C-alpha cells in the first residue's frame, strides 16, 4: 500500500527538508572512513512516502506513549540510513531493522545528524561501500537515506563517548 | 530486540567528548517510526 510522491525543488517542503539535510553533515571521527569524505550532499530528489496503515500503526503507538507521559508524545523527526531502506518503506520498521551490537542495546537508531546515519546506508561500518564501485566514499552512485517521525516519550538519558 | 529502560519508551545518546556532535536516538518498537521522506542523493567532493 505504499506510494512515493515526488516534491518539487520549488515546494516549500522540499526546501526545509534540503535545509535539514545540508545543516546537520558534520565531521566524523573516523575522517570520512563509513560514509565517506564530504561537507555536503547533492539532492537529487525527495519523495513523501504514503501509507496508511502503516500511519495509523504509528499514530496509535503515539496517542499510547503520550497518554503514559501526561499528553507529550516527545516527537521528533530523524534521520535513518539503512541497507534495508526499500523494506522499511514498504512494510514499516520492524526487529530485521535494529542495530543488534549498538551502544545502547538492540534497537532501531536515529541521528539528528544527516552524515551520521550516511554512515549505515552501505551497512555497519559502511560496508564495503558502493555496490558498483566497491567504495565508501563514492561520489557517483546514488544513495538514499529516510527523514523519519520518531516518538521518544519519555527517554532514557545516557551520556557517552 | 532490547526492551527499554524500565519507565522509558525510548534512549538518548547524548554526545559527551566530541562538543561538536548532535545527539542519536533508540526506539525499541518499529511503530514509533514513521519513515515519512525518502531522498536521494549523492556525497560531493570537497573542492
Ligand atoms: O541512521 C542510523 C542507522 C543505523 C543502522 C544500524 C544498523 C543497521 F543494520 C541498519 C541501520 O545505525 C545508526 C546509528 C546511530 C545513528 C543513526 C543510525
Ligand atoms: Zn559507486
Known sequence: ?161 | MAHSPPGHHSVTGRPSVNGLALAEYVIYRGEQAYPEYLITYQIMRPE
Not at chain 1, 7 to 34: C, I, N, W, Y
Not at chain 1, 89 to 101: L, Q
Request: proline letters at 2%; one cysteine or more.
Open chain 1, 1 to 161: 500500500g505504499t506510494i512515493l510522491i515526488d516534491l518539487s525543488p520549488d515546494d516549500k517542503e522540499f526546501q526545509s527538508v534540503e535545509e535539514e539535510m545540508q545543516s546537520t553533515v558534520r565531521e566524523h571521527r573516523d575522517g570520512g572512513h563509513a560514509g565517506g569524505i564530504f561537507n555536503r550532499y547533492n539532492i537529487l530528489k525527495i519523495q513523501k512516502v504514503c501509507n496508511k496503515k502503516l500511519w495509523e500503526r504509528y499514530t496509535h503507538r503515539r496517542k499510547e506513549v503520550s497518554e503514559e507521559n501526561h499528553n507529550h508524545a516527545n516527537e521528533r523527526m530523524l534521520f535513518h540510513g539503512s541497507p534495508f531502506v526499500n523494506a522499511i518503506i514498504h512494510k514499516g520498521f520492524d526487529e530485521r531493522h535494529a542495530y543488534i551490537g549498538g551502544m545502547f542495546g538492540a534497537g532501531i537508531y536515529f541521528a539528528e545528524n544527516s552524515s551520521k546515519s550516511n554512515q549505515y546506508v552501505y551497512g555497519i561500518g559502511g560496508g564495503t561501500g558502493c555496490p558498483v564501485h566497491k567504495d565508501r566514499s563514492c561520489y557517483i552512485c546514488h544513495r538514499q537515506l529516510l527523514f523519519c517521525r520518531v516518538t521518544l516519550g519519555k527517554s532514557f538519558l545516557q551520556f557517552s563517548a
